[PDB]
Amino acid sequence: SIDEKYEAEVKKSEIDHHKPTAGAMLSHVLSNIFYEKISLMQAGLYAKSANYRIKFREIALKEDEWFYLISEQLLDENELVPTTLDEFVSNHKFIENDPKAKYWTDEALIENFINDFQNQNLFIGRAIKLAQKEEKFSLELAIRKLYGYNLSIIPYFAGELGKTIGEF
Amino acid sequence: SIDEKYEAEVKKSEIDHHKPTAGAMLSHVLSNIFYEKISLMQAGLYAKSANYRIKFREIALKEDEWFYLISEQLLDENELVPTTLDEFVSNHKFIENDPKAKYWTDEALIENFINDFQNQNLFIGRAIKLAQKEEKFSLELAIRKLYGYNLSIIPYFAGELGKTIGEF
Amino acid sequence: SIDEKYEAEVKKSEIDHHKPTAGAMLSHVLSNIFYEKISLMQAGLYAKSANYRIKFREIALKEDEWFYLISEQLLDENELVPTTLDEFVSNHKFIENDPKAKYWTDEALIENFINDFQNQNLFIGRAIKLAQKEEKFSLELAIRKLYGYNLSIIPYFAGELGKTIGEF
Amino acid sequence: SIDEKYEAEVKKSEIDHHKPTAGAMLSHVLSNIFYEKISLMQAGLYAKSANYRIKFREIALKEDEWFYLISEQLLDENELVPTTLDEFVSNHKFIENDPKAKYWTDEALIENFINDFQNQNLFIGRAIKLAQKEEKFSLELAIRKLYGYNLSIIPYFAGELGKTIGEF
Amino acid sequence: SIDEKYEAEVKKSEIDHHKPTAGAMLSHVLSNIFYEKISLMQAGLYAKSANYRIKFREIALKEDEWFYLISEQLLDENELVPTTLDEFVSNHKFIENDPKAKYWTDEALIENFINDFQNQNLFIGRAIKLAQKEEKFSLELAIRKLYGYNLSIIPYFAGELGKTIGEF
Amino acid sequence: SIDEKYEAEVKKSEIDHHKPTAGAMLSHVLSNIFYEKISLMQAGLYAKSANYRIKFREIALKEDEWFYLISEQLLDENELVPTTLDEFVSNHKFIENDPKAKYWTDEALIENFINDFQNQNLFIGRAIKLAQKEEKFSLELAIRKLYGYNLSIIPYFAGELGKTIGEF
Amino acid sequence: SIDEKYEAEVKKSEIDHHKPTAGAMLSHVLSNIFYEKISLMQAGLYAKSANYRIKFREIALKEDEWFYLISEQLLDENELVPTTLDEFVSNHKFIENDPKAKYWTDEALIENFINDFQNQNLFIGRAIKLAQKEEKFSLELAIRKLYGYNLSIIPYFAGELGKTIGEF
Amino acid sequence: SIDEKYEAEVKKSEIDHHKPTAGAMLSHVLSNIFYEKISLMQAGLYAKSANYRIKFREIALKEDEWFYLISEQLLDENELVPTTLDEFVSNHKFIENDPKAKYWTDEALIENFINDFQNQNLFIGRAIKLAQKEEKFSLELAIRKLYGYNLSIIPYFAGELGKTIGEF
Amino acid sequence: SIDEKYEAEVKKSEIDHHKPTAGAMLSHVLSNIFYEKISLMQAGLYAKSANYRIKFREIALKEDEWFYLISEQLLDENELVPTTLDEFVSNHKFIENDPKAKYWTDEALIENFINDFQNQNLFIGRAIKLAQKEEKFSLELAIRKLYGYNLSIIPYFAGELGKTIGEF
Amino acid sequence: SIDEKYEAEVKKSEIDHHKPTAGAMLSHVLSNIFYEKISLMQAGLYAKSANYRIKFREIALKEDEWFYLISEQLLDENELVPTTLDEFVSNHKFIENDPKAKYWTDEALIENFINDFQNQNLFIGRAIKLAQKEEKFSLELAIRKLYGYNLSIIPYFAGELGKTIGEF
Amino acid sequence: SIDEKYEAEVKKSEIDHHKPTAGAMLSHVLSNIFYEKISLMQAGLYAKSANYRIKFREIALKEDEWFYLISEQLLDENELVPTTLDEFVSNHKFIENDPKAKYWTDEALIENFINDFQNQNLFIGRAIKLAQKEEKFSLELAIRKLYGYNLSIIPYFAGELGKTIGEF
Amino acid sequence: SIDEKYEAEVKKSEIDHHKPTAGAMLSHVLSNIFYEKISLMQAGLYAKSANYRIKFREIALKEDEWFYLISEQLLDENELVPTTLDEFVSNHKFIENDPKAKYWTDEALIENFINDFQNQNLFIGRAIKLAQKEEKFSLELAIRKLYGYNLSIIPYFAGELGKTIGEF
């Protein structure tokens, strides 16, 4: 019954992945954010300029908020939410911490972030799509607004590397 | 510079996690507070009752700032601080995650949580004397408080179950 | 141009109601928000736990301010808004007043409020759909905030019964 | 038992109404607030001037406030409070809703209310007196404020028709 | 002279107590607030549920507020106010402290207070009446609020034992 | 017509004054506030101690507040309010202005006011009583606060001369 | 040094008034601000639109706080300030009280308030000039804030008549 | 780099203002909102009545931030955004300025303003479907709202004239 | 497990009191804070300068919130807290109530409050020391905030006598 | 009459320019600010560093505020205000937008601003002068404060090009 | 560059402290305000009474911002501003420090302080005309105010001693 | 007696230095902070980057606050506090202003500060020590927190010179 519910969950879990389910696809979207918290707190602590130092922390909150809301909205519509260290490493994709990062130059810290922020917006990009289809009215509109933040983070980061987003 | 300072850290790491520095015993605390958020953040999403749901999201927020502040007093006292997944998984001690805890009763997450925090304090009750020896002055204050905070969560949790602190 | 203004309205309302427009479903939505306020208030006075008495009021307040929101959005797009006891009784569907719910329990109350709210969403969701077609661009946006709020109230209720959305 | 309770209830309302009681009086008072809330909400949607839309909304907000206020007061003295639509319809008095009134001029809405709030006031004033008799010490304090509020709203309105209270 | 004053004082208290005075009555009122403050403070330290700890503290805070309030009121009318422990012990009435009660259940603390605030109320209500008689115009206004506050706190508590005021 | 109105006005003031009316009484009350405002403003400019300058200004501010307050109250009951200088001079009573008093000591300003506020109070108290008689339900509530405010300001002042109310 | 303090003052005031100083014009300025407050208040109670009743009060408030400003600035530079009904009637010029303005219209009111304010500026502007010569450095600065406020009130009034400054 | 990218923009400009991109149809909207401020900012300085004066300065403020935010969602979705006088004068459509409008009645500026905004929406009702096609996700939300905002200004303006939205 | 819970407590309290623990000194500390509140209140009502009446209240407020602080910190570390009139009279030391201090002077009051506070610190300081040994890490930290507050009150008092700490 | 007022305005307008009129000279001062809005919003949008990005927007508000106030103060003293796109380009002088500016380096954006901010302060410099002469008491002091902002903007901008204003 | 510009300053310093620039006469003011803080900051630590203690810490704060703002209007008007110990000790004039003033009566520090500030104004009453000549426009305003601020501290101080401003 | 207390002070003063007295050692700690105010206000005024410009001012406050608190806490425990320009230069050690500093590069301004902030933390380092020994409970904990600020200032300043504190 306790154990019954958990196998039943995990059977349900990847049957749901493998025929793209809007939520299971956001299980990917979520764990990245979780990972990015780690990379961005690092960035706030061991990075160098005060300005970029704080903006990292700033984003480490807002990400933790996007986690919370998106999770809740998944969970309001009765869908499985990734909620543990096994499920996060296992269900993440294309973002990484990296011990070495403490002695990178900022430019290098930031360069990382510009890229693996675009790398967040792909599963988002089809998130979103599986939303409109599934008719997940509430969830969808919340995820669009995620794009924006994910997205607006870039040009901030870009002009910090005094250039344009038309490059990346 | 790149992969050299990383072993002047990683070796000094496992040498000091032995004849114990202050910031090593702490590297376990900091590393618990990381594991801990997740079990809370978990409970704050899954708990049957809405009071607890928010207490958890609140103890969580406070954890993810106890992380920030203990850290900032190490970085400040030129010492090592954990920062990546891999650093956390080696030095986490008695703290846990669980995909199976979603299905526990609210009663349980409290009890479990009572232990998790009792345990934080073994390592902090040491933090702290180590900081008392090394005469790292500012840091003593911040460690003392966190032992406090943690101490009070315990009876908060104790009373929800309808017992005293006296048992646990 | 006097009593004339009126017969045209009841006629265009009944007509609009069968080959059904966004407006005319919302008619039911707003009429039920009205009835809801009433039960919520009643619960806001007579419920037995204070924590629940407060939430019952938090909600009834929100219910007013959704009612105002929708209705603006509506007549911004020149449609008829129900406005008066007669309109709210003939257009309301499946939501009850019952003068002895003051004798039921907080549970019995919360129980029924989940039924109420499920039923509420049927027509939101209807219209929702009716809003996409009619290219009521600022209104659909808004009716999805409703769909969702309602959803958050229903799990909020579920866990106060000690339950997951699942059973409802 | 539930039904044991309800019939004692209804028997008593009738006993108390006819050899009149502070609560009984205040049951039409409250019913009329409930009606007022609607005519006000209608006018704060459909009236022409924005100055009057906002005021009318302000007055409805406040009636709700007065509702909760007088009701808890009465509850504290173990008194019955009209809580459902079917209680509000039986016990209301001289306040109407009119679907036609959306088609009225601002000047006639104002003028209509001068009347309602005036009529509201003759139950209030009677009530006021019973509360004294019945030594309901904190109830009386409250009704006197309701009385006063209606008087401030009457010459609000009187001055908006460029007249003076004296006329009406 | 100092002692000239004090003995006039004590003689008068006794004259005023026995052919009773608004002030005299209010001297047990105030003494009971002073006692209440303690039982409340005890329960807001030792009670099990955090919801009740915070409430109990809130009620003690407020009793202090009511203390200062009623006292300055009485001072303005040149009246004697109990100010010391030895005045509080003589003039208190039906409120006890119990060191044992830390070992009581929340349910019995709640229940005990229902009783105190009820008993507090029969001096208040008597007082209320003398204030009128003695034409103490702004004093009366005040005691009526104290009376009401106790009534709101009684069914606060009654609903927390899942009952209704009517019982007690 | 304008002049039709004014002479009805003045005739009535005289009828109402002599077989005395709550409004009539309150017309000297208000006149004395108007005078008070001046002596207070003078002392809050010319007094020596900054502690007394600020207090005196605070008391003038508040008299203005009480002015507007009592007046609208009276307006709501369709009553005449003294509004001009020539009404304030006829109807004032025992409050003076003195250009000499800028040359007084703080101690004698304080002392002078003890007197004014005392005298203010015997119209207020009379007024208070008529309001009752005349069943002016929200007026009475108000005057009682004015009465109380003057009493709090009297022993404010009494304690500033290191004495106690009892003396004056 | 007693009644002596006074004759010197009336003599130095009359003297200062003819070969006229900044002080002695301000005497008229402050005395008119006083009279103004009175008419504004009267309008703040009796005017017919509420929007105008509020502005009439906004202003009278500002009029108090200019009166205080000027007067500080003044006696900061050791000059005599009018302070008392006798000073304010003998030094006031061209500003009226009139007990039947409560019967005129908002327009008739606003009309006259433009006349009033124009006249006010004559003496500000006088003194202004008187302040430049006397090298009253902090006072002139301040009297120009007055000149202007007054100016904003006069067009404010002009447009509520439906007009440009031009016609006045 | 200098004068080369400027035609890779200016030519891509007039090619896309043809087979329409999202950000081109918008370049007209953004370009209206620029023209619009000026006619408002105008009215906010010249209007006969002080209510309108502020509504205009407020719709103005909101326009000059609708500019900022639509822009920031283009810059973000690497697209062109207008920015100089010359860009605005070519792409402004049906929007106007006028030195002669100072002398209009307040009535007129409302009517005129009703048109200006009706017109904004032709181009936004297109904005928007173009954004719906290109699957520019974040931007859809922001365009939808602005169609809303604009939609509500219309009936605000309609009711000031004493008509419904139904005409315009 | 009933009345048993109690005898164990009085026995472990008396035992703990002789070979004295941090807990058992604090017992005296808290019991004196209690007595202090009482005298401070009394002074907060009867003192003669208002400035002193306010500070006497500022303090008594702080005294409550130290009492709560200490007591938390305490039972966080499972120790017994005095809680009830009997505990506070048998454990209090050297701090007085005296019903005729209302007749002494502000000076005579302040004088004695320095004696009171000196005496208070004796036991804080004791325990303080008792807290260092018992490794009550979060409690000692806190008892030093007390030591100091008390110290600031004593010079605050010294200078209101016109004196330096020196003479006390 | 409508057309009569506009020729009459324009005849008056340049007769007023050509014999320097303080206001007509500020008609120049104003339009620059208007132009600078355009150049600075550009700067906020398409520039690169976050810090300088925002400070541009910041100044685009404050300029829009200087527009507003200065305009109002002109307009209080009955003087013509530039209030349209024809009058702004026609009556500006020595500031320019420049499409190309989107791809300038910041240094280059900023370099522009330092210069054409000095270029604002010349007509200001003689603004100011025509004020003192015309005796425009209110206007003058407002324009001095404009200097400061215009002026303090420079050294901000200067040290951003790590240098001194003693250069430019 | 290094030791060359320092004499193009230091010589221009002593040449301009002769045929006086604005910013030289000020260099003495700025240099007083530095000395002044210290005697205040002193008094704010040592004064017998707690009112004065805070007035001083407050005048102090205000001084240490009058320093900041006068400075920022020089730096802005490319002029020299004092900044080091040695600059201050040469140009301080009549201002003082004293280790012996700790033991003065509160009376004395007021009197002394009255002089210190009377003296500030000789140099500011000159500041100011120098700024009036050089047509340094913004700076005139700021100097005028400070003469004001200083002017008002004087009578604040005068009245504490129980005299008028008229003596000092 | 006045002169008696000052020799007696200075005899006491260096007897206290020369056998390290915790307070006399903080007399050193204090005067540096005082000196640093001078160096940091300089830095805010004549430095170049806006960011580092303000952070200097920020620290000039916080230092002035550390002065205040630390002083007070010394002074609560009856110890001599440095409180004058003679005692500050005489009792400082190892921090210096430097006229030349106005034309240093920021890097050079900052480089200074990093060093002579470590140079503050040495006497602090043994401050602190003499505290624990002397048993100065309150003082100690305040000084630890000084370390932190002094300390955390460094890594801010360090990463501004894009490096680590492990260098300096």
Q: Where are the domains of chain C?
A: 1-168
Which pair of tokens denotes residue G72?
A: 């500080």
Nearest CA distance, I6 vs chain B (angstrom)? 15
**Of B29, B51, B27, B53, the residue nearest B40 (C-alpha):** B53
Element spanning B31, H or E: helix B22-46
Three-state DSSP class for L97? coil
Tokens of H84: 């100089």
- CATH architecture of the domain covering G1-168: Up-down Bundle (1.20)
What is the three-class DSSP state of A31? Answer: helix
Which positions in chain A touch H78 (Cβ < 8 Å)? 164-166
Closest-CA residue of chain F to K152 = F50
| Dihedral angle sign, alpha carbons of residues D132, D135, D140, D141 | positive
Would you say L38 and K12 are in contact if contact means Cβ atoms under 8 Å apart?
no
The set of residues, in sequence order, having a beta carbon less than 8 Å from that of E26 and lying 6+ positions away, is E70, E74, E79, E123, E127, E143
Which residue in this structure is represented by tokens 């009805």?
F8
The single residue listed with the structure tokens 């039911």 is: C28
Instruction: Tell me the C-alpha distance between G106 and F12, whole Å.
Output: 25
Q: Spell out the residues 6+ positions from residue H115 whose beta carbon is closer than 8 angstroms to its own.
A: H94, H168
Distance of CA C23 to the CA centre of its chain: 14
**Positive or negative, the Cα torsion across A52, A55, A61, A65?**
negative
Neighbours of D126 (CB within 10 A): 17
Is J in contact with K (3 or more beta carbon pairs below 8 Å)? yes
Contact L70, L146 (CB under 8 A): yes
**E strand residue ranges, H13-54:** none
Whole-angstrom Cα distance, residue C67 to residue C145?
12
Nearest to L38 among K6, K41, K84 (CB): K84
Count the Cβ atoms, other than its own, within 10 Å of residue C14.
10
Q: Do H48 and G162 meet the contact criterion of CB atoms below 8 Å apart?
A: yes
Residue F76, token pair as written in the block: 């709501």
The residues on G that touch F, with CB distances below 8 Å, are 2-3, 5-6, 9, 35, 38, 41-42, 44-46, 57, 64, 67-68, 71-72, 75, 81, 83-87, 97-100, 102-104
Q: How many angstroms separate the CA of residue G106 from the nearest CA in chain F?
A: 14
The single-letter DSSP state of residue F19 is S
CB contact under 8 A, I85 and E38: yes
Residue keyed to tokens 């301080």 = K92
**E99 contacts in I (CB within 8 Å)?**
6, 9, 83-84, 86-87
K35 chain-L contacts, CB cut-off 8 A: 85
Q: Are E138 and E157 in contact (CB under 8 A)?
A: no
- For I60, the 3-state DSSP assignment is helix
Of residues J17, J62, J72, the one with CA closest to residue J37: J62
| Cα of E49 to nearest chain B Cα, Å | 5
Measured distance CA(H64)–CA(J44) in Å, rounded: 13
Query: How far is CA F111 from its chain centroid?
Result: 17
Experimental resolution (Å): 2.9
Inter-CA distances, F123 with F20, F21, F127, L123, Å = 12, 12, 6, 70
Distance from the Cα of B61 to chain C's closest Cα (Å) equals 21
Q: Which residue has the tokens 């007067």?
A: G71
| Residue whose entry in the numeric block shows the structure tokens 């007399």 | L27
- H22-46 and H7-16 are packed helices; what angle lies between their axes, rounded to 10 degrees? 90
Separation in Å, CA of K36 to nearest CA in chain F: 22
Which residues have a C–N gap over 2.5 Å right after them in chain K?
A: none
Task: Check J164 against K78: CB less than 8 A apart.
Answer: yes
Contact E53 B159 (CB under 8 A): yes
| Cβ-Cβ contacts under 8 Å, F156 against chain I | 50
Chain G residue at shortest CA distance from J139: G148
Instruction: Based on DSSP, count helices (H) and strands (E) in chain C, helices before strands.
Output: 6, 0
Report the C-alpha dihedral over residues J76, J79, J82, J84, rounded to 10 degrees: 80
Q: CB–CB of F27/F12 below 8 Å?
A: no
Burial category of E133 from C-beta neighbours within 10 Å (exposed 0-12, middle 13-18, buried 19 and up): exposed
Q: Shortest Cα distance from C152 to chain A (angstroms)?
A: 6
Mutate to test the interface with G, among J138, J139, J140, J143 (most CBs of G within 10 A): J138
d(CA B20, CA B13) in angstroms, rounded, equals: 10
Q: Considering only CB atoms, which chain A residues are within 8 Å of H138?
A: 144-145, 147-148, 151
Task: Give chains near E: 3+ CB pairs under 8 A.
Answer: B, C, D, F, I
CB atoms within 10 A of CB E110: 21
Q: Tell me the C-alpha distance between L45 and J152, whole Å.
A: 12
Single out the residue of G45, E141, F131, F76 nearest to residue D149, CA to CA. F76
Contact across the interface for K49 and I163, Cβ inside 8 Å = no
Contact between chains at J51 and L48 (C-beta distance less than 8 A)? no
Q: For residues H130 and H144, is the Cβ–Cβ distance under 8 A?
A: no
List of chain J residues whose C-beta atoms are within 8 Å of the C-beta of residue L105: 162
Q: Which long-range contacts (CB under 8 A, 24 or more apart) does H57-60 make?
A: H57/J68, H59/H153
Chain center to CA of F33: 3
CA-based nearest distance I9→chain F, Å: 48
- Answer whether J152 sits within 8 Å of K77, measured CB to CB: no
C-beta atoms of K162 and F51 within 8 A: no
Q: What is the CA radius of gyration of chain E?
A: 17
d(CA C102, CA D10): 13
Tokens of G47: 């005017």
